[PDB]
Amino acid sequence: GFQNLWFSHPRKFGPGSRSCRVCAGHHGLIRKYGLDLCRRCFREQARDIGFKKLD
Amino acid sequence: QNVTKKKKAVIGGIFKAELNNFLMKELAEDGYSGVEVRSTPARAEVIIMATRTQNVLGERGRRIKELTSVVQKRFGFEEGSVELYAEKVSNRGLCAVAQCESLRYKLVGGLAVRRACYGVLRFIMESGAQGVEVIVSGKLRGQRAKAMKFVDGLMIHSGHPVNDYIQQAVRHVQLRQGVIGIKVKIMLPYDPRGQNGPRNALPDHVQIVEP
Amino acid sequence: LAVLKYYKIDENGKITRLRKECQQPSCGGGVFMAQHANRHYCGRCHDTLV
Amino acid sequence: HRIRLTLTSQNVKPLEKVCAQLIDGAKNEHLIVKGPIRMPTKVLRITTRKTPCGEGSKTWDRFQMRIHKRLINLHAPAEVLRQITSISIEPGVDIEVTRA
Amino acid sequence: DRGLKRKHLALIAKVQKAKKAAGVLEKPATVKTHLRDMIILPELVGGVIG
């Protein structure tokens, strides 16, 4: 029934198992060091996280 | 817990970023300016630098208590392990974020864009900034969008000294016609005491000791 | 209003249950089982008895 | 026993200030202090496309974060460490003690 | 070895039932299925599947 059909399909791996922690998007996701931020999320939050553009 | 130092630093950065985002969304009317996170192993103190500590704290420190409890619950801290202090920003005119929020307030109120940005420019310049640049872009007049720029004083754009001397802020305003973007840039003054601006002079400014 | 249909009032005054009552460990007296053509179905549980 | 003080930071100036404070405390106490041991710096690099879409020339932002680590070896059974550790603090630097 | 799934076993049972409930002269009733990854086993030969 509904209980065993609403989200039956597993989501343990693949693009659909992850998302940016700000916009919840599955595209262009950085997973290095557990950032879990999209490539657009990170460009905005980098200064706060502590990533600087040295060279 | 046992975690690599790289992951510890990354987690600290992520926590600081999320806290800053949440606080700027919550205490915007409170004249929020910034947040500093001191995450010592024993307790995590969080300094909320704002212009109105009275409003930030609220009645008998109830809003601050709510915020600390909420932060603890959100980030899975222990009761009393995370704690917030409020703090009053010395010079509100030299803080880009506060000026951006004030311009936001004026525009939502309905003040003419030219009048509002000129008032903000005058206040910032009187506050002691070397230079100021305010840009307001969007559907200001008519269907076609335009950008209005107001510049006073001297302002630098390129090089490392930008990171030390320039303070920027960006905000958005939702009016009937659409979204209007506000950008504020302030060039802080050379403050040897290190209170109103960077302690070190500009790299190309050679100062002579009078004989 | 079928609640009254699972109770037979004897002329003397006491009552007798007209439906096979359930025997599940959790749900017991009170809850009744349906009078299906060939089976009897617990409503509060599964407990199908043929 | 050997007490290991490990100091980590992302900025060199506060880390060196804290190190110098701790060495000064140990020397003042007259302890067997082992000079600041400088671990190789860890550089975490993230290279990303500047554009939020797929249009334009392919330009990349090269963000990087640096982590610096310092070790201090102490031969101190007495109660002096708590004093030295507690007196000297500085934001941005995280310290921890191990009983090696 | 990893194990056939419950839907697959149900399909096997349905096809076997359809084959059983049909005379040799005529063809078994169509069994419609979405399972395109089901293995064709000797239990399956003789039936007709949509």
Next chain:
Amino acid sequence: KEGALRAVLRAAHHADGLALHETCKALDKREAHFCVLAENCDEPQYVKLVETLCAEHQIPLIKVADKKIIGEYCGLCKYDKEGKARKVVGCSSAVVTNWGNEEQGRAILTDYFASKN
């Protein structure tokens, strides 16, 4: 005594022990302390039916003629900032599995309906 009953069943409802369909199952479990009934119930088979189980399970009863008052006696109606009963529903029967407020009045009504029976 109506006030004492109201005070008791208010806390009963708050504790979620206040309960036809539910009342039958309640007195089948015998957790019921008493049942409040109405004489306006036109159903001849239901009227006697309910007291059959009540007496059989030894759960004496209180009878209040009309049903709209017992409907009011639950807190299930919306008020005009003054407790104004509005849009009440028939409550031909009810059960109290757990006790409520008005402790002294609760003792009083327990003694009353245990002695007069």
Next chain:
Amino acid sequence: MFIPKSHTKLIYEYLFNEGVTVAKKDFNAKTHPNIEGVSNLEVIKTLKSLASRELVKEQFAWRHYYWYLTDAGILYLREYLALPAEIVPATIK
């Protein structure tokens, strides 16, 4: 939303006790991290109803709903759950 009365009771009890409530915007999580028994969807919908009725102040940031109890909310909640007027949430204390 169709929610059991007991589930609403636990949600409301936690909300009154704490004065604040946090819930990830994850309609599918079956266990709200702080509240036991109820699911994230039930908590989200209950507190969204409270916000709609103006008993709670709502904020959103980074896929996390944040909710703060108001004065109308404290009045309504004390009346609903039937507490003594002396009890108050930890925030007010």
Next chain:
RNA sequence: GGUCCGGACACCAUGACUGACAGAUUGAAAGCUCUUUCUCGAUUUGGUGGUUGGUGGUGCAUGGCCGUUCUUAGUUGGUG
């Protein structure tokens, strides 16, 4: 192809309304629907307003970001 409402809040109503054995049904152990009558019982259900969601349209309504004009040396007041 099929399922759920995850349609807040307000107003007006008419055991209001959930759920699941088994047969049929379905790609389906989907109580989706039809056979069957059991079960929680004010949360729901219907309508009217109002919301909510949308990788739906419009980048020729917009914000932010990026690319390019343009990696060249180019640009602007004040008082005359």
